[PDB]
Chains A and B, each alone.
With several copies, the nearest count.
Chain A
Amino acid sequence: EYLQAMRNFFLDTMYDFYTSIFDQNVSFLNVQLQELDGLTLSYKVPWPVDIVISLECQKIYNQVFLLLLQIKWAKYSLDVLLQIHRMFLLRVKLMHFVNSLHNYIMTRILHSTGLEFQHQVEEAKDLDQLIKIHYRYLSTIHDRCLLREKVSFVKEAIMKVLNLALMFADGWSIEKMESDFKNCHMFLVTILNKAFPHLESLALS
């Protein structure tokens, strides 16, 4: 139940938590939770649960929570509407991709491993192997989500394609966005072809 709540706090209430951030005091947002990069926050973990839950645990989840907030940030900024026609193309050239990225982050990483890990810890009968499967879940999400290395040629592309949505949201000139976009898209698909062994599922998108 703590594991379900932990993936509920890092990665309902979170969209309210971010619509506060959309336009600050970060302890106010903690109380709002209790009912593009940067920023840290902590919450206390009780001791008999904190001896089977790691400390490196919190860091690894805080990284992907910031990533999910950036994903929803670009998805919300890129919808700003409810030559004059040209702006429309710079929606869908962008609106799909940060969304297709959302198909790879959610299902392929945060839904397969996240669902199997909760099932794995329920069947453990020993105290050591529950910690070991937790650490091997942390390492395999450290490999699936790229936090390690080659993250100055891959993760910066992921950041800057969300930055393009911010630049379109301000602009609501247009022709100077797609030249950057196709360039970083070509770099991304030439790197993510097989060069961890599951990144080809986004290179076809």
Chain B
Amino acid sequence: REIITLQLGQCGNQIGFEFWKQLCAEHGISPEGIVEEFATDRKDVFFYQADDEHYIPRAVLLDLEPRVIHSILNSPYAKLYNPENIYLGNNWASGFSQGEKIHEDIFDIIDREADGSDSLEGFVLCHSIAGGTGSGLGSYLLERLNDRYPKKLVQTYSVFPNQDEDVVVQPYNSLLTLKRLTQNADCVVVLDNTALNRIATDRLHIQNPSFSQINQLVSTIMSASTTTLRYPGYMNNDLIGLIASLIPTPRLHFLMTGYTPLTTDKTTVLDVMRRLLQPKNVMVSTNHCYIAILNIIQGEVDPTQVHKSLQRIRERKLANFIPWGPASIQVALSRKSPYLPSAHRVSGLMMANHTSISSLFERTCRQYDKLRKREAFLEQFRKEDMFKDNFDEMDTSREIVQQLIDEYHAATRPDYISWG
């Protein structure tokens, strides 16, 4: 149903601001909120129907030692939102300890925004793992959402720190936050710095300003994933029914996210499905195969081509899956948005669970272990000491992700009556 973006981390606040200006350009609205004269469709998934048809976006801004709010303040997006929703470190443990003492008023902010909405179903998070301020505070917020709301959803659109081995404290923080995301979040959409950066270097001619184009890529991905919710289709437009088909394996909830236009500047659905199953078009980094696949096609589509494309895709064995059930590739259709300022309105998306992400997780399972053996990169921060005296929480996270690896490899088998 209706979901409220909780932005946290520096890149998380960047993709939150980019997402709101993307939705301001997408919908027929002013930068005050007033309805335009070119804008019935639904505008109630992220926007409250406020005073003068002011579609005020429902958002939560969280950070520590504020940086980006100045860029919000001198912009016309301090006149679109903020009726009072903006709240003002460098390690997971420092962020955890800082979020421990101010858990009351941030939980009051969560309660205020839950009372502000009209139908609460899930809390979507626009977050960056090891963004600085996001690490630790984000995991503690995930623990608070799991403890206080077991009946609602926790969605995490997130990028994960991979530099292909830069920063020597981020594998500890990412593994601990990944354990918190397994136990305290309901669905994770995984993205990577190397995958988005490599595709950005491919489709463009940049290498240094990676952040500003990663904001555009993540905003387009998030708008494509919520296109069928914001603009009315008639399939599974609640978040619960949409993610219900998307997760085949109840512990393996990390989803591949491809996008057939890497740059948005003719084609059939067969060709973009053949494109979309290739990992080079996917922004996500032995026997690896999917468990269940679903794809969403929006544009100037002929539905009988969706028929023949599904027929040929599953029969030519490019949907690669050996499940313990019948779980399969799924087609889905969406209506492309009226009054996009973007041209070339044919666009495709895939949301599938693949075991190949386990190999990328194994790199993190290497890195922490490697940095535990050299012992000059745990850095002996005192906040890590007061977090846990035995430092066995990192071993617990390693155990949880090792169970995750064994569950991926058991889901490759036709039996899931045994995992390691």
Q: Report if A3 contacts B (CB, 8 A).
A: no
CA distance A72 to B119 in the complex (A): 19
CA distance A72 to B248 in the complex (A): 18
Chain B residues at the A interface, C-beta cutoff of 8 Å: 1, 42, 119, 150, 186, 232, 234-235, 237-238, 240-241, 244-245, 248-250, 292, 303-304, 306-307, 323-328, 330-331, 333, 416-419
CB of A103 within 8 A of CB of B330, answer yes
Partner of B326, one of A88, A100, A106, A111: A100
Q: Of all chain A residues, which has the CB nearest B418?
A: A85
Q: Report if A15 contacts B (CB, 8 A).
A: yes
Chain A residues at the B interface, C-beta cutoff of 8 Å: 11-12, 15-16, 72, 75-76, 79, 81-83, 85-86, 88-89, 91-93, 95-97, 99-100, 103, 106-108, 111-112, 115, 205
CA distance A106 to B42 in the complex (A): 22
Are A100 and B328 also in contact (CB < 8 A) when A86-B417, A88-B250 are?
yes
CA distance A107 to B301 in the complex (A): 13
CB of B416 within 8 A of CB of A85, answer yes
- Distance in angstroms from B51 CB to nearest chain A CB is 20
7 closest Cβ contacts across the A-B interface? A92-B325, A96-B326, A96-B327, A93-B325, A92-B327, A79-B244, A15-B238
CA distance A100 to B325 in the complex (A): 13
Partner of B416, one of A15, A81, A82, A89: A89
Residues of A within 8 A of B303 (CB): 107, 111-112, 115
- Distance in angstroms from B321 CB to nearest chain A CB is 11
Partner of A76, one of B241, B324, B330: B241
CB of B419 within 8 A of CB of A97, answer no
Total of A-B residue pairs, C-beta within 8 Å: 74
Residues of A within 8 A of B306 (CB): 107
Are A205 and B234 also in contact (CB < 8 A) when A89-B416, A108-B307 are?
no
CB of A107 within 8 A of CB of B331, answer yes
Residues of B within 8 A of A97 (CB): 326
Residues of B within 8 A of A115 (CB): 303
Taking chain A's interface residues, is the majority helix, strand, or loop, or is none over half, making it mixed? helix
CA distance A205 to B244 in the complex (A): 19
CB of A81 within 8 A of CB of B417, answer no
Residues of A within 8 A of B326 (CB): 92-93, 96-97, 100, 205
Q: Of all chain A residues, which has the CB nearest B245?
A: A99
A–B pairs, 7, beta carbons within 8 Å: A79-B244, A81-B250, A83-B417, A92-B324, A95-B248, A107-B303, A205-B328
CB of B307 within 8 A of CB of A15, answer no
- Distance in angstroms from A7 CB to nearest chain B CB is 9
Residues of A within 8 A of B416 (CB): 85, 88-89
Q: Of all chain B residues, which has the CB nearest A91?
A: B250
Residues of B within 8 A of A205 (CB): 326, 328
CA distance A106 to B228 in the complex (A): 15
Are A75 and B244 also in contact (CB < 8 A) when A96-B325, A100-B328 are?
yes
Taking chain B's interface residues, is the majority helix, strand, or loop, or is none over half, making it mixed? loop
Residues of A within 8 A of B328 (CB): 96, 100, 205
Residues of A within 8 A of B249 (CB): 92
Residues of B within 8 A of A76 (CB): 240-241
- Distance in angstroms from B199 CB to nearest chain A CB is 31
Residues of B within 8 A of A93 (CB): 325-326
CB of B186 within 8 A of CB of A82, answer yes
CA distance A170 to B318 in the complex (A): 38
CA distance A83 to B245 in the complex (A): 25
CA distance A112 to B302 in the complex (A): 9
Partner of A99, one of B240, B330, B418: B330
CB of A85 within 8 A of CB of B307, answer no
Q: Of all chain A residues, which has the CB nearest B243?
A: A79
CA distance A112 to B240 in the complex (A): 26
CB of A15 within 8 A of CB of B237, answer yes
Q: Of all chain B residues, which has the CB nearest A90?
A: B325
Residues of A within 8 A of B418 (CB): 85
- Distance in angstroms from A177 CB to nearest chain B CB is 13
Known: A92-B324, A95-B327; 6 extra A-B contacts, CB below 8 A, are A89-B324, A97-B326, A103-B330, A107-B333, A111-B333, A112-B304
Residues of B within 8 A of A12 (CB): 42, 232, 234, 237
CA distance A91 to B244 in the complex (A): 11
CA distance A87 to B192 in the complex (A): 33
Residues of A within 8 A of B232 (CB): 12
- Distance in angstroms from B152 CB to nearest chain A CB is 9
CA distance A79 to B186 in the complex (A): 13
Residues of A within 8 A of B419 (CB): 85
CA distance A75 to B330 in the complex (A): 15
Residues of B within 8 A of A111 (CB): 303, 333
CA distance A98 to B41 in the complex (A): 29
Q: Of all chain A residues, which has the CB nearest B232?
A: A12
Residues of A within 8 A of B330 (CB): 99-100, 103
CA distance A115 to B326 in the complex (A): 30
Residues of B within 8 A of A89 (CB): 324-325, 416-417
Are A72 and B241 also in contact (CB < 8 A) when A89-B324, A89-B416, A108-B307 are?
yes
Q: Of all chain B residues, which has the CB nearest A106?
A: B235
Q: Of all chain B residues, which has the CB nearest A82?
A: B186
CA distance A197 to B416 in the complex (A): 36
Residues of B within 8 A of A91 (CB): 250, 325
- Distance in angstroms from A131 CB to nearest chain B CB is 26
Residues of A within 8 A of B119 (CB): 16
- Distance in angstroms from A36 CB to nearest chain B CB is 18
- Distance in angstroms from B355 CB to nearest chain A CB is 15
Residues of B within 8 A of A72 (CB): 241
- Distance in angstroms from B113 CB to nearest chain A CB is 21
